[PDB]
Amino acid sequence: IANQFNSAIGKIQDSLSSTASALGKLQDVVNQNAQALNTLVKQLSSNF
Amino acid sequence: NKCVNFNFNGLTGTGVLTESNKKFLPFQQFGRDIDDTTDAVRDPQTLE
Amino acid sequence: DGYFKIYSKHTPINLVRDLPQGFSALEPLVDLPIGINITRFQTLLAL
Ligand SMILES: *[C@@H]1O[C@H](CO)[C@@H](O)[C@H](O)[C@H]1NC(C)=O
């Protein structure tokens, strides 16, 4: 049970080291807030 | 290095003026930020 | 709009018969206060 647990915590390092995509739901929140501020600043350049 | 009302050629606003590391080519007279706002200026009486 | 705009570039090559691969923008070289209508053009080569 300890070797299976130690091996599984092993794979958590391998997943969180290897891919970029595993943290997608946090990066999506950071991206949406950055995209809304990019929009808000771009509207200052609009003539109306 | 002091807050100033600047008026370059009628391009006008308030800011602190600081020496650029921006290499403006001989044709360039204003600089523009990602925000689409003026962020650097070539002085009209000395080419700095 | 009564201007004529010239952009240009100069580059070293080693090539026998084509327009070369790669990318490089043309800086503005001169602008002229021309005013004229244009509809065709010609080039001058040395004899
Ligand atoms: C502004 O005047 C000074 C003194 O005549 C001169 O050194 C300077 O080059 C002038 N600026 C330009 C753009 O020539």
UniProtKB/Swiss-Prot annotation, chain A:
Heptad repeat 1, as annotated region: 1-48
Phenotypic consequence of D28N: In strain: Delta/B.1.617.2, Mu/B.1.621
Outcome (variant: N47K): In strain: Omicron/BA.1, Omicron/BA.2, Omicron/BA.2.12.1, Omicron/BA.2.75, Omicron/BA.4, Omicron/BA.5, Omicron/BQ.1.1, Omicron/XBB.1.5, Omicron/EG.5.1
Domain of life (superkingdom): Viruses
Protein's job: Subunit of the fusion protein that is processed upon entry into the host cell. Mediates fusion of the virion and cellular membranes by functioning as a class I viral fusion protein. Contains a viral fusion peptide that is unmasked after S2 cleavage. This cleavage can occur at the cell membrane by host TMPRSS2 or during endocytosis by host CSTL. In either case, this triggers an extensive and irreversible conformational change that leads to fusion of the viral envelope with the cellular cytoplasmic membrane, releasing viral genomic RNA into the host cell cytoplasm.
Protein name: Spike protein S2'
Organism: Severe acute respiratory syndrome coronavirus 2
Gene from which this protein is expressed: S
Segment of the intact protein contained: 923 to 970 of 1273
